[PDB]
């Protein structure tokens, strides 16, 4: 979704992580490989805000 | 192979191990035959005691 739409429909602007993996079933002794969709990681606008569930959010620094 | 060779640190050894575990037979594909015994070569530096 584009950023504007995310605010209009109360969504979260994010990105999808796909990584490759293989499982050798102990019984099988053979290899199957696919890229799994692990999840969604949020993206930032250049101004430094994140849109999460329709809300502009900002992370403060700590000392 | 050469008549004169000098002692060197590198230690080339070959390890041949059984493919499957003992007592458990895996399914054999009709197209490809199973490999009962296999062999491999490993390179390990000589190690001081």
PDB experimental method: cryo-EM
Which residues 6+ apart lie within 8 Å of A9 measured at CB?
A1, A54
3-class DSSP state of B38: coil
Rounded Cα gap, residues B39 and A34, in angstroms: 30
Rounded Cα gap, residues A4 and A56, in angstroms: 12
Contact A21, A32 (CB under 8 A): no
Nearest-Å Rg of the Cα atoms of chain A is 18
Contact A59, A29 (CB under 8 A): no
Angle at A63 between CA A40 and CA A52, to 5 degrees: 25
> On the CB side of B42, how many CA atoms lie within 13 Å of its CA?
9
DSSP character at residue A44: B
């Amino acid at each position: 979704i584009k950023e504007r739409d995310a605010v209009y429909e109360s969504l979260t602007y994010s990105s999808e992580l796909y990584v490759s993996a293989g499982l050798i079933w102990k019984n099988s002794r053979d290899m199957q490989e696919q890229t799994i969709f692990i999840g969604n990681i949020p993206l930032m606008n250049s101004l430094g805000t994140s849109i999460v569930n329709g809300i502009y959010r900002i992370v403060i620094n700590q000392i | 192979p050469d008549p004169l060779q000098e002692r060197d640190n590198v230690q080339l050894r070959i390890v041949n191990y059984i493919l499957y575990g003992n007592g458990k037979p895996i399914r054999g594909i009709s197209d490809t035959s199973i490999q009962l015994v296999r062999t491999c070569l490993v390179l390990n530096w000589n190690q001081d005691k």
